[PDB]
A = this chain, B = another copy of it.
Amino acid sequence: PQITLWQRPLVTIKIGGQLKEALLDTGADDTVLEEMSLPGRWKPKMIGGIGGFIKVRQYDQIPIEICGHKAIGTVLVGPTPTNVIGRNLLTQIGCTLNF
């Protein structure tokens, strides 16, 4: 699809058996989601944005589906004010900026 930027680019993702809304975010290196359970190993991480840092749990090799597009990657979970899909997953679905 071609996604306009007149509005926030929100999409539905499927992750950990759940459906969530998230922002397609080219300024985010990593995908960050609000608190949720995910299976498997994790390690603590600090990530920083406007306003400073938050502590998150880093889960690797997590399956996700975005717009019918399956991918796998790292998902950071913690107290983000909004769910973001970052570049680590945007690449996998073949997402580009065009102008």
Q: Residue among A2, A50, A99 with the most chain B CB within 10 A?
A: A50
Q: Indicate the size class of the contact surface on chain A.
A: 35 or more
Contacts of A9 in B (CB 8 A): 26, 97
Contact A1 to B91, CB < 8 A, known contacts A27-B84, A51-B53, A54-B51: no
Q: Is the pair B49, A5 in contact by a Cβ cutoff of 8 Å?
A: no
Q: How many copies of the polypeptide does the oligomer hold?
A: 2
The answer to the question of A94 belonging to the interface, with a C-beta cut-off of 8 Å to chain B, is: yes
**How does the 8 Å CB contact mask read for A40-83 relative to B, with 1 for contact and 0 for none?**
00000001111111100000000000010100000000001100
The answer to the question of A14 belonging to the interface, with a C-beta cut-off of 8 Å to chain B, is: no
The answer to the question of A18 belonging to the interface, with a C-beta cut-off of 8 Å to chain B, is: no
